[PDB]
Enzyme design. Structure first.
Site, short mmCIF file in Angstrom:
data_model
loop_
_atom_site.label_atom_id
_atom_site.label_comp_id
_atom_site.label_asym_id
_atom_site.label_seq_id
_atom_site.Cartn_x
_atom_site.Cartn_y
_atom_site.Cartn_z
N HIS A 214 -5.85 2.17 10.74
CA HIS A 214 -5.37 1.63 9.60
C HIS A 214 -3.92 2.02 9.95
O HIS A 214 -2.79 1.92 9.23
CB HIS A 214 -5.76 2.33 8.40
CG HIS A 214 -7.05 1.93 7.90
ND1 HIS A 214 -7.59 0.75 8.34
CD2 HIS A 214 -7.56 2.26 6.93
CE1 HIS A 214 -8.89 0.78 7.96
NE2 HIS A 214 -8.83 1.42 6.87
N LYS B 89 4.58 -1.28 -4.09
CA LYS B 89 4.07 -0.74 -3.01
C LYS B 89 4.37 0.56 -2.83
O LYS B 89 5.26 1.08 -3.45
CB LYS B 89 4.13 -1.14 -1.44
CG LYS B 89 5.27 -2.34 -1.61
CD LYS B 89 5.45 -3.05 -0.12
CE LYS B 89 4.20 -4.06 0.06
NZ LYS B 89 3.78 -4.76 -0.94
N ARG B 90 3.85 1.44 -1.84
CA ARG B 90 4.27 2.86 -1.66
C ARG B 90 5.76 2.82 -1.55
O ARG B 90 6.41 1.83 -0.99
CB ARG B 90 3.79 3.58 -0.43
CG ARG B 90 2.48 3.96 -0.51
CD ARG B 90 1.87 4.17 1.05
NE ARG B 90 1.55 3.23 1.82
CZ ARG B 90 0.34 2.45 1.95
NH1 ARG B 90 -0.59 2.83 1.34
NH2 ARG B 90 0.25 1.53 3.03
N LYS C 130 8.97 0.52 3.77
CA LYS C 130 8.59 -0.63 3.08
C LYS C 130 9.80 -1.19 2.48
O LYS C 130 10.02 -2.58 2.14
CB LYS C 130 7.77 -0.05 1.66
CG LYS C 130 6.55 0.46 1.97
CD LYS C 130 5.46 -0.77 2.22
CE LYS C 130 4.20 -0.42 2.70
NZ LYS C 130 3.36 0.31 1.71
N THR D 79 -2.60 -5.44 1.82
CA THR D 79 -3.55 -6.37 1.37
C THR D 79 -2.81 -6.85 -0.26
O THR D 79 -3.29 -7.74 -0.65
CB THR D 79 -4.97 -5.16 0.93
OG1 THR D 79 -4.36 -3.94 0.28
CG2 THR D 79 -5.55 -5.11 2.27
N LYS E 12 -4.05 -10.60 -2.40
CA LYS E 12 -4.28 -10.80 -3.74
C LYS E 12 -3.16 -11.78 -4.25
O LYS E 12 -3.71 -12.51 -5.34
CB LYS E 12 -4.25 -9.58 -4.43
CG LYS E 12 -4.16 -8.52 -3.74
CD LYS E 12 -4.83 -7.43 -4.27
CE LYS E 12 -4.71 -6.10 -3.42
NZ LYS E 12 -4.29 -4.84 -4.14
O1 LIG Z 1 -5.83 -1.82 5.80
C1 LIG Z 1 -5.57 -0.75 4.95
C2 LIG Z 1 -3.99 -0.50 4.89
O2 LIG Z 1 -3.56 0.89 5.39
C3 LIG Z 1 -2.21 1.22 5.46
O3 LIG Z 1 -1.93 1.84 3.80
C4 LIG Z 1 -1.31 0.29 5.79
O4 LIG Z 1 -0.01 0.36 5.62
C5 LIG Z 1 -1.84 -1.38 5.52
O5 LIG Z 1 -1.09 -2.20 6.40
C6 LIG Z 1 -3.27 -1.62 5.81
O6 LIG Z 1 -3.57 -2.62 4.60
#
Ligand SMILES: OC[C@H]1O[C@H](O)[C@H](O)[C@@H](O)[C@@H]1O
Ligand SMILES: OC[C@H]1O[C@H](O)[C@H](O)[C@@H](O)[C@@H]1O
Lengths: 830, 830
Positions: B354, B560-561, B566, B672, B676
Site C-alpha cells: 500500500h 483525507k489525512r 496531501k 479510494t 466514491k
Molecule cells: O490502497 C489503500 C490506501 O493505502 C494508503 O492509505 C494510500 O495512501 C492510498 O494510496 C491507498 O488507497
C-alpha cells in the site's frame, strides 16, 4: 404464563440470538447461559410490571443498603418462585440436558461474604414474596473476596472469576449513572450554600438484578453500582507519549472501588479505598432514590413527603455516610435548611447493628475522612455540635463528671474540643456507629440478647436519651431457598403431613409436625429423606475433597468464617480426642464406643489472619492422616470443603445430622446458618448466645445440645486466667501433646497451641476459652453419640427442630421491619 | 423473511428483554439499540447458515488481515443488503421514530483510520455479496484513534467513546480465545523441536461482527480480537497489601494492546506496544484459522491440503509476522520440518503493498524484536540465510559488486553478517517488507502505476528473481455503501435510465448512462438529485460547523489525512487567492469571475505532527474571517468538518460537485475517496497519480480536471530547488504576504510558510512542491469556475464520471484477488 413447549423455543432462541459462544455444539455453559436468559425474559415482564405499579401508586418504598449481598445462584429460586420448575426441566430434556447439570454451571454471585450478606439476600426474597415495595442497593464487586483453594499447603487465594463471561441475570442501565466525587475543596457561593468543587470525579453505573417473589409477580431489584470514568478521561497525550500506565490512572483508580470486597486496610491506601467504597454506595444510592422520589412526585414536589415516601436501612456501620450525604444533598443541592434536612434525614434513615463488642465498631481517621470527604466532615461536625448541645440541655452541668463522661461516650468525634465549655498525642477519630445512632430514627439488634446488649451497654447513654429508637429485629432466613428448593425431599414430606403446599408462605404450619413427631411412619420418610440428601453430598465431597465417605455415618457440620472466636479449633480438637481414644482401643471396642462420623469443615480465612490460616492447615492434616488410617476406616472422616458459599450450603445443610455453632459465648450477635440447619431437620450443638438462645427455646431445650461457659461469665473466666486459677482438663493437655508428637506429621504446630497457652499476652492466654469450654464440649459430643444411637429419639428431635424453626422465617423479620420501622405496606401486582 | 408487522414486535421485544436502558421511556438511543438487536437476529440466521454450509463443504476459505477496518455504521447497509429497508422504516413509525433519526444514534466503528482500513471494509462487502468464502481478522480497538474536536484553537484530541454503551452488532465468543506470548526464552526439548517458554501470557478473545452480502444470505465475519488476562492473574496479595496499581499491572498491559490504533511510537514503550499489536493479530488469527482447518479436516488431516484450504492476505507490512508465526506453528507445535512448513507458508500467504516510497516501508530493531519475539527472530534468520543461498545460487560469484549489492538490497536483516562469504556503529534492523516479498506467493500493488513502481523500483531485484509473484489489484469501493445507500436519489435515477435495479451487482450497467449523458431530461433529474443531497449537507454543516451555507454554490470537497504530502494548503492557498482577488474588486465584478463556492475541508492530523495541526488551525481561521465578511457573503465559504469518518463521507460525497485529490504527484499509491466521488457524479481535480490516472482514463480526459508536475519530474524540480532555479509565481508570493499581514488575525503563521521557504533543509524547501504546482492549480480552478457556468456541459461531465466509475467497484477487485491469488470459488447458500 409459558410451558415446556414454549420454553424449549425460548432457550433455542437465546442460544442462537443472544449468544456468548460460537455455534459449534450446545455444551453445558452454553445451555446454562441460554436457559438463564430465558428466565430473565420472564423476570423482566414482572420487573416492568412492578415498576409500572410502583410508579403509578408512588407509595412508600424501602431501601436496604448493604456492603454485601450473598445472592448465591439465581436459577433454581427463580424458576421456583415463578413456579416454572417443571417446564424448564422438561425443556432441557428436549435439548439434551437436565436441570441439575445446568444449575451446576452457574457461579455463585460473589457479591458478599458472611451472614450480614446472606441476611440481605434472604431479606430480598422475603420482600418480593410479601409484595413489599423495597429495593436493595449494593456494589457490583468484580472479583468478590476470593476463590478458596485448599492445597496440600492449606488455604490459598485466587480472584473470583464469576464475571469472566458475565452474569446473565443482570441488566445494565446505561441511562442510570450518577457522579461521585472524592477529595477537593468546599467554597460558599453567593447563594449562601456550600459548593464542593474539584478532587476526583467518577461515574457509578447501575446494574439491576431482578429478585422475584414466590408465587407472586412482585419482582424487585438489587441495583448494583459499578464504577468507571467517562472515556473522555483516557489520557491520549500520555498514552501516545509512552506513559501507558499513567494514561490509565483515572480508570485504574475508579474501577478499583468495585474490584474486591473488604480490601485489606493495613495500608493507608486500603483505608482510602474502603472509605471510597462506603461513600460510593451511600452517594450513588441516595441520588438514585432521590431521583426516583422526584420523578414520582411530579410538579407537586414536597420534601416533607420524602420520609413518608422513602426509608433507608443502613446494614451495619458501612452505610453510615447516608446520614451526612443525605444532609448534603438536601442542603447544598436541593436548598433546604438545617432543621428541615435533619428532620427528614432522621425520619428516613435507620441503623441495624450486627455487632456486639464496642471495639468491633467502625471508626475512622478524622484527618483521612477530611481529605476525602471535606463537605461530609463539615456536616458531621455540625451534627456533633448539635449533639453536645442536646446532651447539655437535657442533664445540665450538674456533676461535671456525669456531664463530661457522657460527652466522651456519645460524641461522634473522638479526641476533639467543645465549641464552648466550663470546668470551674491523641489521634482524632470519627465514630460511625455513633453517627448512625443519632442520625437514624431506629436502632435494632439482630436477636433478643443482642438487642439487649446494645440497649444496656454499647449505646447505654443513647438509650437514656432516646429510648424509643431502640428495638429488636431477630434474624431470619428464607423458607424458599432454605427448605423448598435446597431440600425437595424434606418439602414433599412437609407438604404431605401438613396437607397443603402453603407452608412455603404460611410457615407457621411447620408447627403442625409436632403432633406427628412421634409417628413412626413420618420418622421413616424423614430418615429416608435425610439419607437421600446425604447420598448427594457423598458424591460432592468425592469430587471436591477427593475423600470417599459413607452415608450411614452421622454428618457433623461446622461452616463459618474461619476465626478464633468461631473456634473451629475446639471442634477439630474434639475430633482429635475421639481419634486418640479410638487408637487406644481394639477394633471391636472402637466400633462400640464411637458412632461413625463424617465431620465437615468449610469457610474462608482472611489471607492476612495467620492463625486462622494455620487452623485451615491443621484441619487438612488431621483429615489427611485420619482418613488414610486403615485402623480407623469409616468410623471417622474429617473433610474441609473448599470455597464454602451459598451453593455448598444449599447442599450440606439438607444433609446435616448435627451442626456446630460453638463460638465463644456472648460474641455471636445472631448467626443465620443455625436457622437454615434447624429448618432442614438438623440438630444443633452450640454455646448459649445469639440466635442459638431463641432456637433452643423454640425447637425445645431437649432437642438442642448445649455446653460451655455463658456470656456473662467470660470476663470472670478470663480474669481467672489472668490471675492463674484456670486448672486445665487432663484431656485438653492430652490432645496438645498428641499433636506435638507430630501425629499429623511434618508441619509444626507449636505456633497454633502457642495462641492458647500462657496466662498473659496479646496472642497468648486463649482469649476464646477453648481449653475451658473443651471438657463440657467433648462430653456433650458424647451425648450426641448416645442420642444418635437411639434413632427413634434422634429422629424425633430432628423433626422438632423443623417444627420449631418457623419463627426463623425471614418473612416474620421483614413484616416486623416493614411495620415497625419502615411503615411500608404491601402493594399487590395484578 | 419478516415484514414491518413482525419487526415492530422484534424491536419491542429487544427493547424490553435485551435491554441496556431503564424502562422509563423509549428514547432515541434505546430505539437504536433495540433496532440494531433486531437486525442482528436476522444477520445471525444467515451467519449460522453460512457457517453450516462452510463447515460441511470445507472448501477453500480466504482471510483478510488488516491493522485497520473502517466499518463505519452498520444499520443502513445491513437492512439494505437484507432488503428490509422498507420494513424497518415502517416498524419505527409505529414506535414513534423514523429511520434516519435512529441511524444517527449509531457511532462509526472506530476500528480503522484511512483508506487501507476502508479498503478492507469495502472488500468485506464485496466478499459477502459475491458469496466468496472469506473472513476478516482485525483488532477490537476500544478507543479508536481519536474523536476530533475543532475548537477555536484548531484541532484537539479526545478518546473515541463508541464502546461506552457497547456495540449491538458484535457477538462475543467466550469459547473462542487463544494464548499469546511475549518475551521469554526458547529451549530445544528431547523431541528436537523448539519450546518457547516464559515471558508474558495474555488471552485473545474473539468478537464476531456479521458482514451481510447484498441480496444474498452469505453472511461472513469480521472476527475482532480483544486482549485480556484470565481473572486468575489479578494479584490479590498485592491489592490487599496496598499496591492497587501494581495488582492491576498484568491486565493494564494486556488490555493496552487494544486501547488505541497506531499508538505513538516515539517512545520505546510505544514501539513495543506497536509490535505487540501486530503479533497479537498475526498469532491469534492464524491459531483460529488453523483450528478451523483442523476441525473441518477431521480424522483425515493432511497439511499439504492447508494452502488448498486456506489463503492469508497480508494487508500491508503490519501482518508480516504471519510468515514466521505460521512457520512457528507448523514446526514447533505441529511437528512438520522446514521444507514442508515453508512450502505451505508461501502457498498460503500473500502481500498487498500500500506504499510507494522505500523509506515509508516498515522496519524494526533487531534487538527489540529479539527481546519480544525470540522464536520469531530465529525463524526470520533461517529464512534470510535460506535467501542469501538463493541469491548466490542464481548469479555466480562473477561480478562480486553485483552479488554484494544484491545481498544488501534484498536481505531481510539490515546491517548483518553472512554465514560464510568471499571477496578474494550500524544499527541492526529487520525489514518486514522484504520478509513479506519472500514469504508470500503473491505481491500486488493497488493501481497500475503503483504496481509498476513495486515491480521496477522498490522490489526491483525480487522481480528479477521471482517475476511471477508480482501482479496488480487496482483498488475499488463498494457500490452498496457508496451509491445505493449513501445516495438514494442518485440510485432512483440510475435504476430508471438503466433497465433494472441490477446495477448494484452488475455495475457495468452504469456505462449505459453514456448514451443519455447529453439527454436534457436526465440532466434535470441529475441536478435535482445532486441539489437534494446538498440540501441535507447544508443542515449538517449548520449543526457541526456552525456556519450557514447555501445549496446553490459549488461544493468543493477535500477530505483525507491532514498532511503536507496531501497538500491541503495548496487548496486553502488557492482559496485565499480567490479571496484576495475578490476584495480587490467591486461587488458587481466580484460576482462575475468567481462562481459561489462552499469549500469543505475535513480529516484528522496526528497529534504529534505539528505542521499538520498548524494546517488545521490555518484553515479554521481562513473560514473564520471569510465566512464572517459582509463583503464576501455567500460567494465563498470555507468550512472544516470535525471528525471526518465514514458517516460524514456518506453525506458529503453524494452532494459533491468538485472534489480534490491533489497530493504531490508520484506519492499517492491509489486513494479510494476519489472512486466514491466519481461514482456519486462528482468531478475530480487532482494530480496525475494513483487511482487518479485510471479514473481519468475511464471517466474521460475532459471530464476530469488535471494539473501539476508529474511523478517523474519531482526529483528534477526538487533538484531545481536545491540548486536555486525554481523562481516562484508572483501570485504565490502575494498569498504569503497577505497572510503575513495577519488578515486571519492574532494567530501568527510565519513558521507555517517557514516550511515552504528556503532551498535547503529538513523543514524548509517545500519538499511537496506547493509553490511550484500552485500556478497551474489556481488556473485549473479557473477552468472549473468556467465549466460550472456551462451547466449543460458540467452536468454532462458529472454523468460521465458515474458512467465511467464502474471499473472501480470493489466487486471487480475481489473477483481478481479471488481468481488470481486466493483461488477461492463462490459458495452459494440455499
Ligand atoms: O490502497 C489503500 C490506501 O493505502 C494508503 O492509505 C494510500 O495512501 C492510498 O494510496 C491507498 O488507497
Ligand atoms: O446479623 C448478621 C450477622 O452479622 C455478623 O457478622 C455477626 O457475626 C452475626 O452474629 C450475624 O449473623
Amino acid at each position: 404464563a409459558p410451558d415446556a413447549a414454549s420454553i424449549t423455543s425460548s432457550i433455542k432462541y437465546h442460544a442462537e440470538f443472544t449468544p456468548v459462544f460460537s455455534p459449534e455444539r450446545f455444551e453445558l455453559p452454553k445451555a446454562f447461559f441460554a436457559t438463564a436468559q430465558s428466565v430473565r425474559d420472564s423476570l423482566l415482564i414482572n420487573w416492568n410490571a412492578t415498576y409500572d405499579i410502583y410508579e403509578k401508586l408512588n407509595m412508600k418504598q424501602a431501601y436496604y443498603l448493604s456492603m454485601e449481598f450473598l445472592q448465591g445462584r439465581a436459577l433454581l429460586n427463580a424458576i421456583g418462585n415463578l413456579e416454572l420448575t417443571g417446564a424448564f426441566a422438561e425443556a432441557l430434556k428436549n435439548l439434551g440436558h437436565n436441570l441439575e447439570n445446568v444449575a451446576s454451571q452457574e457461579p455463585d454471585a460473589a457479591l458478599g461474604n458472611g451472614g450480614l450478606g446472606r441476611l440481605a439476600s434472604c431479606f430480598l426474597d422475603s420482600l418480593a414474596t410479601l409484595n413489599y415495595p423495597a429495593w436493595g442497593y449494593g456494589l457490583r464487586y468484580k472479583y468478590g473476596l476470593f476463590k478458596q483453594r485448599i492445597t496440600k499447603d492449606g488455604q490459598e487465594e485466587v480472584a473470583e472469576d464469576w464475571l469472566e463471561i458475565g452474569s446473565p441475570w443482570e441488566v445494565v442501565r446505561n441511562d442510570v449513572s450518577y457522579p461521585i466525587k472524592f477529595y477537593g475543596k468546599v467554597s460558599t457561593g453567593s447563594d449562601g450554600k456550600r459548593y464542593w468543587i474539584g478532587g476526583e470525579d467518577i461515574k457509578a453505573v447501575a446494574y439491576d438484578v431482578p429478585i422475584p417473589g414466590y408465587k407472586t409477580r412482585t419482582t424487585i431489584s438489587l441495583r448494583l453500582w459499578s464504577t468507571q470514568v467517562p472515556s473522555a478521561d483516557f489520557d491520549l497525550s500520555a498514552f501516545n507519549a509512552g506513559e501507558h500506565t499513567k494514561a490509565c490512572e483515572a480508570q485504574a483508580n475508579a474501577e478499583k472501588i468495585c474490584y474486591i470486597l473488604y480490601p485489606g486496610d493495613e495500608s493507608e491506601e486500603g483505608k482510602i479505598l474502603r472509605l471510597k467504597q462506603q461513600y460510593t454506595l451511600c452517594s450513588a444510592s441516595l441520588q438514585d432514590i432521590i431521583s426516583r422520589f422526584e420523578r414520582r412526585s411530579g410538579d407537586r414536589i414536597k420534601w416533607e413527603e420524602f420520609p413518608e415516601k422513602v426509608a433507608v436501612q443502613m446494614n451495619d456501620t458501612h452505610p453510615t455516610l447516608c446520614i451526612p450525604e443525605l444532609m448534603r444533598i438536601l442542603i447544598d443541592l436541593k436548598g433546604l435548611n438545617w432543621n428541615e434536612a435533619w428532620n427528614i434525614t432522621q425520619r428516613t434513615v435507620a441503623y441495624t447493628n450486627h455487632t456486639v463488642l464496642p471495639e468491633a465498631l467502625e471508626k475512622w481517621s478524622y484527618e483521612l475522612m477530611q481529605k476525602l470527604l471535606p463537605r461530609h466532615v463539615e456536616i458531621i461536625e455540625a451534627i456533633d455540635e448539635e449533639l453536645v448541645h442536646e446532651i447539655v440541655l437535657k442533664y445540665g452541668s450538674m456533676d461535671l463528671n456525669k456531664l463530661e463522661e457522657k460527652l466522651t461516650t456519645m460524641r461522634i468525634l473522638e479526641n476533639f474540643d467543645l465549641p464552648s465549655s466550663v470546668a470551674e498525642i491523641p489521634p482524632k477519630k470519627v465514630r460511625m456507629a455513633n453517627l448512625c445512632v443519632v442520625g437514624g430514627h431506629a436502632v435494632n439488634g439482630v436477636a433478643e440478647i443482642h438487642s439487649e446488649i446494645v440497649k444496656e451497654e454499647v449505646f447505654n447513654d443513647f438509650y437514656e436519651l432516646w429510648p424509643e429508637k431502640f428495638q429488636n429485629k431477630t434474624n431470619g432466613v428464607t423458607p424458599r431457598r432454605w427448605i423448598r428448593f435446597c431440600n425437595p425431599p424434606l418439602s414433599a414430606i412437609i407438604t404431605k403431613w401438613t396437607g397443603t403446599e402453603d407452608w412455603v408462605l404460611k410457615t407457621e404450619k411447620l408447627a403442625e409436625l409436632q403432633k406427628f413427631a412421634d409417628n413412626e411412619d413420618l420418622q421413616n420418610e424423614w430418615r429416608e429423606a435425610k439419607r437421600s440428601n446425604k447420598i448427594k453430598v457423598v458424591s460432592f465431597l468425592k469430587e471436591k475433597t477427593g475423600y470417599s465417605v459413607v452415608p450411614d455415618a452421622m454428618f457433623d457440620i461446622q461452616v463459618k468464617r474461619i476465626h478464633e472466636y468461631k473456634r473451629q479449633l475446639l471442634n477439630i480438637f474434639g475430633i482429635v480426642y475421639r481419634y486418640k481414644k479410638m487408637k487406644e482401643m481394639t477394633a471391636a471396642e472402637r466400633k462400640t464406643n464411637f458412632v461413625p462420623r463424617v465431620c465437615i469443615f468449610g469457610g474462608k480465612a482472611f489471607a492476612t489472619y495467620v492463625q486462622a490460616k494455620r487452623i485451615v492447615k491443621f484441619i487438612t492434616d488431621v483429615g489427611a492422616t485420619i482418613n488414610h488410617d486403615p485402623e480407623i476406616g469409616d468410623l471417622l472422616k474429617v473433610v474441609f470443603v473448599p470455597d464454602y458459599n451459598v451453593s455448598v450450603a444449599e447442599l450440606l445443610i439438607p444433609a446435616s445430622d448435627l451442626s456446630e455453632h460453638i463460638s465463644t459465648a456472648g460474641m455471636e450477635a445472631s448467626g443465620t446458618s443455625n436457622m437454615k440447619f434447624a429448618m432442614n431437620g438438623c440438630i444443633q450443638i452450640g454455646t448459649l448466645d445469639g440466635a442459638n438462645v431463641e432456637i433452643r427455646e423454640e425447637v425445645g431445650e431437649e432437642n438442642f445440645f448445649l455446653f460451655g461457659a455463658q456470656a456473662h461469665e467470660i470476663a470472670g473466666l478470663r480474669k481467672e486466667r489472668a490471675d492463674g486459677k484456670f486448672v486445665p482438663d487432663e484431656r485438653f493437655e492430652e490432645v496438645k501433646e498428641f499433636v506435638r508428637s507430630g501425629a499429623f506429621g511434618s508441619y509444626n504446630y507449636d505456633d497454633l497451641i502457642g495462641s492458647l497457652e500462657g496466662n498473659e499476652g496479646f496472642g497468648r492466654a486463649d482469649y476464646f476459652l477453648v481449653g475451658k469450654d473443651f471438657p463440657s464440649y467433648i462430653e456433650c459430643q458424647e451425648k450426641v453419640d448416645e442420642a444418635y444411637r437411639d434413632q427413634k429419639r434422634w429422629t424425633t428431635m430432628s423433626i422438632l427442630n423443623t417444627a420449631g424453626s418457623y419463627k426463623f422465617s425471614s418473612d416474620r423479620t421483614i413484616h416486623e421491619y416493614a411495620k415497625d420501622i419502615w411503615n411500608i405496606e404491601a402493594v399487590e401486582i395484578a
